Design a protein around this ligand. Sequence first.
Ligand SMILES: *[C@@H]1O[C@H](CO)[C@@H](O[C@@H]2O[C@H](CO)[C@@H](O[C@@H]3O[C@H](CO)[C@@H](O)[C@H](O)[C@@H]3O)[C@H](O)[C@H]2NC(C)=O)[C@H](O)[C@H]1NC(C)=O
Ligand SMILES: *[C@@H]1O[C@H](CO)[C@@H](O[C@@H]2O[C@H](CO)[C@@H](O[C@@H]3O[C@H](CO)[C@@H](O)[C@H](O)[C@@H]3O)[C@H](O)[C@H]2NC(C)=O)[C@H](O)[C@H]1NC(C)=O
Ligand SMILES: *[C@@H]1O[C@H](CO)[C@@H](O[C@@H]2O[C@H](CO)[C@@H](O[C@@H]3O[C@H](CO)[C@@H](O)[C@H](O)[C@@H]3O)[C@H](O)[C@H]2NC(C)=O)[C@H](O)[C@H]1NC(C)=O
Ligand SMILES: *[C@@H]1O[C@H](CO)[C@@H](O[C@@H]2O[C@H](CO)[C@@H](O[C@@H]3O[C@H](CO)[C@@H](O)[C@H](O)[C@@H]3O)[C@H](O)[C@H]2NC(C)=O)[C@H](O)[C@H]1NC(C)=O
Ligand SMILES: *[C@@H]1O[C@H](CO)[C@@H](O[C@@H]2O[C@H](CO)[C@@H](O)[C@H](O)[C@H]2NC(C)=O)[C@H](O)[C@H]1NC(C)=O
Ligand SMILES: *[C@@H]1O[C@H](CO)[C@@H](O[C@@H]2O[C@H](CO)[C@@H](O)[C@H](O)[C@H]2NC(C)=O)[C@H](O)[C@H]1NC(C)=O
Ligand SMILES: *[C@@H]1O[C@H](CO)[C@@H](O[C@@H]2O[C@H](CO)[C@@H](O)[C@H](O)[C@H]2NC(C)=O)[C@H](O)[C@H]1NC(C)=O
Ligand SMILES: *[C@@H]1O[C@H](CO)[C@@H](O[C@@H]2O[C@H](CO)[C@@H](O)[C@H](O)[C@H]2NC(C)=O)[C@H](O)[C@H]1NC(C)=O
Ligand SMILES: *[C@@H]1O[C@H](CO)[C@@H](O)[C@H](O)[C@H]1NC(C)=O
Ligand SMILES: *[C@@H]1O[C@H](CO)[C@@H](O)[C@H](O)[C@H]1NC(C)=O
Lengths: 661, 160
Amino acid sequence: CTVRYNVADCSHLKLTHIPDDLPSNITVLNLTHNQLRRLPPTNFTRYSQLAILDAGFNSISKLEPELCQILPLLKVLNLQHNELSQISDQTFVFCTNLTELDLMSNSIHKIKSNPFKNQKNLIKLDLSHNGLSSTKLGTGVQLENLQELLLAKNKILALRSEELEFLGNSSLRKLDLSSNPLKEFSPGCFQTIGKLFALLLNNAQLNPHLTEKLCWELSNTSIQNLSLANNQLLATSESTFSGLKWTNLTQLDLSYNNLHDVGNGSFSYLPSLRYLSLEYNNIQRLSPRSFYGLSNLRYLSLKRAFTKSHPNIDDFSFQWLKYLEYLNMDDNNIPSTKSNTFTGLVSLKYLSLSKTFTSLQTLTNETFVSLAHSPLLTLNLTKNHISKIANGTFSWLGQLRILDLGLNEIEQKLSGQEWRGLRNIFEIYLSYNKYLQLSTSSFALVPSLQRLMLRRVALKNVDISPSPFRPLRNLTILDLSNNNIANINEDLLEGLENLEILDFQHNNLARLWNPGGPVNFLKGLSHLHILNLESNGLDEIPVGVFKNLFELKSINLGLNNLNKLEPFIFDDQTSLRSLNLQKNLITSVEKDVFGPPFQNLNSLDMRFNPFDCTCESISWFVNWINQTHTNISELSTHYLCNTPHHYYGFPLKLFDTSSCK
Amino acid sequence: LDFQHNNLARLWNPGGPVNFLKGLSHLHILNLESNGLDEIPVGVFKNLFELKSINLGLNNLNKLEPFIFDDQTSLRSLNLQKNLITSVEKDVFGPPFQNLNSLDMRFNPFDCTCESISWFVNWINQTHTNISELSTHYLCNTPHHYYGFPLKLFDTSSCK
Ligand SMILES: *[C@@H]1O[C@H](CO)[C@@H](O[C@@H]2O[C@H](CO)[C@@H](O[C@@H]3O[C@H](CO)[C@@H](O)[C@H](O)[C@@H]3O)[C@H](O)[C@H]2NC(C)=O)[C@H](O)[C@H]1NC(C)=O
Ligand SMILES: *[C@@H]1O[C@H](CO)[C@@H](O[C@@H]2O[C@H](CO)[C@@H](O[C@@H]3O[C@H](CO)[C@@H](O)[C@H](O)[C@@H]3O)[C@H](O)[C@H]2NC(C)=O)[C@H](O)[C@H]1NC(C)=O
Ligand SMILES: *[C@@H]1O[C@H](CO)[C@@H](O[C@@H]2O[C@H](CO)[C@@H](O[C@@H]3O[C@H](CO)[C@@H](O)[C@H](O)[C@@H]3O)[C@H](O)[C@H]2NC(C)=O)[C@H](O)[C@H]1NC(C)=O
Ligand SMILES: *[C@@H]1O[C@H](CO)[C@@H](O[C@@H]2O[C@H](CO)[C@@H](O[C@@H]3O[C@H](CO)[C@@H](O)[C@H](O)[C@@H]3O)[C@H](O)[C@H]2NC(C)=O)[C@H](O)[C@H]1NC(C)=O
Ligand SMILES: *[C@@H]1O[C@H](CO)[C@@H](O[C@@H]2O[C@H](CO)[C@@H](O)[C@H](O)[C@H]2NC(C)=O)[C@H](O)[C@H]1NC(C)=O
Ligand SMILES: *[C@@H]1O[C@H](CO)[C@@H](O[C@@H]2O[C@H](CO)[C@@H](O)[C@H](O)[C@H]2NC(C)=O)[C@H](O)[C@H]1NC(C)=O
Ligand SMILES: *[C@@H]1O[C@H](CO)[C@@H](O[C@@H]2O[C@H](CO)[C@@H](O)[C@H](O)[C@H]2NC(C)=O)[C@H](O)[C@H]1NC(C)=O
Ligand SMILES: *[C@@H]1O[C@H](CO)[C@@H](O[C@@H]2O[C@H](CO)[C@@H](O)[C@H](O)[C@H]2NC(C)=O)[C@H](O)[C@H]1NC(C)=O
Ligand SMILES: *[C@@H]1O[C@H](CO)[C@@H](O)[C@H](O)[C@H]1NC(C)=O
Ligand SMILES: *[C@@H]1O[C@H](CO)[C@@H](O)[C@H](O)[C@H]1NC(C)=O
């Protein structure tokens, strides 16, 4: 087995017999994924100190009580994926300390007598996928402290007040009744339970009339979390949920219930709900009175809550949701917005509208007029086929912090008036766009940015003086990768004292680093953390470009052609934590180049390089590798030399340096 | 026969290499430039006696198996420029160099070592083959002492 500290785990050993050779100073034993004839009752004499046993995923036919007598200190008893054709009460008469019983696949058809007259400390009772037909588990009052009762993937036809009366004072935190073909509910079947809080009815095929009758039956109860998923709730009426008007609910779920129509006042009898979900529904439309009465909701999800003839939302449809703060409408097909769609939401702070608009190619200053009176903090608009934005689009939303406009085809000459009205925004998501032309005043109106990534935007004309990034001072993260920049001067990025993260992947900086004077990039970047110039076609590193980068942490210069390693290139990089030079054309590793970066390096990566197995090239590198604990992944595999012929295709570590000094 | 830019690299172990050019005696010029070939197996240029030109440039060829060119006794022009050739061995480029008229292997990471270029340097010193840009685009890439050094100006007195 693994034989780790204290606990013992045996993932896969093809074990067939209970072993007794392992040390006895253990408290947990694992038997998952093993083939056993039958659990012996007398072989546990040696192991009488196990707190719990993970004896599951086993082909055990019959269970004997004597086992859990030899181990009185037994807490978790998992018997899932086992045969267990039939069980009786005599297995649990002198077996009381159980706290966790798991029966997930045992094909237990009928329950006889009272098997649980002695278990007084059990909390979770998982009895599912066993073909159980009647929810009766006993006649007398038992299960004083039972918090979870799982009954799923069985064939219960109905619930009756007499088969559930055996729970006298049980306080069930979570009740599971999923995948049960329930067709009717006897009156008073829920009042016999002491205190029930949550219920699950997934894959239970609830009819709307059956759902209404269930809601009537659920009155007087302390239910707070109710879930109704995978049903035939194609429509909802005013009186459908009226039976829940006497309950104090917290969460209501209606996902995967193909709801087509929402009646007027459907949830008007729910003055205490705080979280609501309508995921994956073919809702035709939402009337303004559909949400009437929901004055206490705080989280609404409308993911895939619309039909393909296209669905639309009327104005003033969210006025009643004055306490909502998290609205999600991802993956929908609303054509466009109106003047009074979001009007009424006075507490919305997190709004997601990803892939929800189809006819909103052009954005004006009337699209987000409804959100002026709402202090939003996050706005998601990805995959919305955004093509053009007008001035004053975000003027109303002056409290925005997180803005998303990526994964679109925006094409426009940015002038800085597109962000007019934004007071204090944290970061802007404009990656993955077809064409965004920058100007000298594009970022002047918003100097409060903290993160700014422009991946795959085909940006151009960024060498214009003054740089558009000049007004940004406290910016921390900047990304201009995958854009194929033609050229850049030292004017850009100047004054970014607070900049920490910089990425220049796929930007062809080859010629920018001797003719016309080398560009002295990275001037005074004290706060820069990680520098990434991977796959920029770099061919030669000019001297004096990594200076003053004392606080730099990581360097990634892979997928390039670097062979001319100038001496003393890395002098101030004494705080480097990870050096990446994989897939380059490095031939020799000299001490004067990689010395200071190797003083306190944590991980190194320069694989796929034509190394030269010679005393002049890798002797210092081989000595350092042999005399360091730096994490070098695939050191023995992808570090083969390319020259000479004798040492071609040989591991870098398998080189003797005792003959050269 | 011209196969420029066709991605024939992996065709020369997918169930055994394909023995292409099987008994193609009358072919005169063969051009397979810029196909990314990485390894040429033995017994692929057999029965090519009348072939005159081979052009395998703009590829990545470093594994030169012995006796690759055995029937290329009538080769007139060999082109291997802009490849990843590191060493030039006699047993590989012997027969093609018997009557070669023009040779082109510029822009290659040559290794200025005794085992690699000694025979090639001697051949260059004692041949009349017309080679363009021989002293400019034939600089070695390793070691550091011989990096960026002309290939023709190599002393073989310390070799053999
Ligand atoms: C359990 O749920 C039932 C509903 O199924 C609740 O019944 C409701 O009980 C209240 C209080 O007894 C009734 O209000 C009363 O109405 C009479 C007129 O009939 C009025 O004179 C009283 O002043 C009082 O307002 C209410 O009508 C009744 N509703 C129904 C539909 O029966 C019951 O309160 C819940 N709790 C318990 C512990 O049963
Ligand atoms: C706005 O909604 C869209 C809906 O798709 C969100 O897109 C999803 O965002 C997550 C988190 O960024 C992405 O997961 C990521 O996957 C990549 C690998 O592709 C992984 O490297 C990251 O660590 C992360 O796990 C997810 O792929 C992405 N889905 C699509 C289709 O783009 C978007 O994040 C939302 N905007 C927010 C929350 O600001
Ligand atoms: C969204 O932004 C646009 C762009 O500024 C605003 O359009 C502006 O609307 C005002 C009032 O309609 C225009 O003022 C008047 O325009 C007429 C010509 O239409 C002119 O003859 C008058 O002397 C007066 O200037 C203004 O010109 C117009 N701007 C542009 C560039 O056409 C629009 O009002 C904004 N919408 C919201 C809701 O903020
Ligand atoms: C959205 O905002 C941009 C940025 O301000 C507006 O572009 C600006 O439009 C004005 C008005 O046409 C331009 O002023 C013009 O300048 C020329 C000289 O170049 C002058 O001869 C004209 O009489 C006029 O004053 C301004 O140059 C231009 N700026 C840029 C950077 O393009 C745009 O018009 C706004 N659009 C809407 C719909 O409000
Ligand atoms: C219903 O389920 C929700 C979701 O788990 C429970 O709310 C969580 O309560 C814990 C405990 O305070 C918090 O840490 C979580 O942040 C809450 N999550 C959400 C989404 O609200 C709620 O307590 C449950 N109702 C019960 C058990 O009656
Ligand atoms: C939620 O719980 C509250 C508190 O128990 C219920 O309010 C009580 O309602 C009864 C009538 O059934 C009154 O006699 C009590 O005086 C009320 N107490 C308080 C503190 O208001 C409420 O009815 C429950 N249900 C809903 C939907 O709120
Ligand atoms: C549900 O209630 C809404 C009101 O919230 C009703 O919508 C109104 O319909 C009338 C008739 O055309 C219009 O004059 C009103 O302007 C509408 N209200 C709003 C806010 O626009 C709707 O008709 C009701 N539906 C049912 C089936 O009763
Ligand atoms: C740029 O970021 C800095 C760092 O947070 C901001 O400085 C802080 O701003 C908050 C906002 O009120 C103040 O409470 C702090 O006292 C400021 N810290 C210091 C050291 O001055 C700065 O305001 C930001 N500038 C812009 C334009 O957003
Ligand atoms: C358990 O005890 C029986 C009886 O001695 C023995 O045959 C068997 O090998 C022991 N171990 C297991 C894993 O059954
Ligand atoms: C349940 O609670 C009632 C009332 O407090 C009490 O009379 C009864 O003994 C309790 N039963 C159990 C099994 O705790």
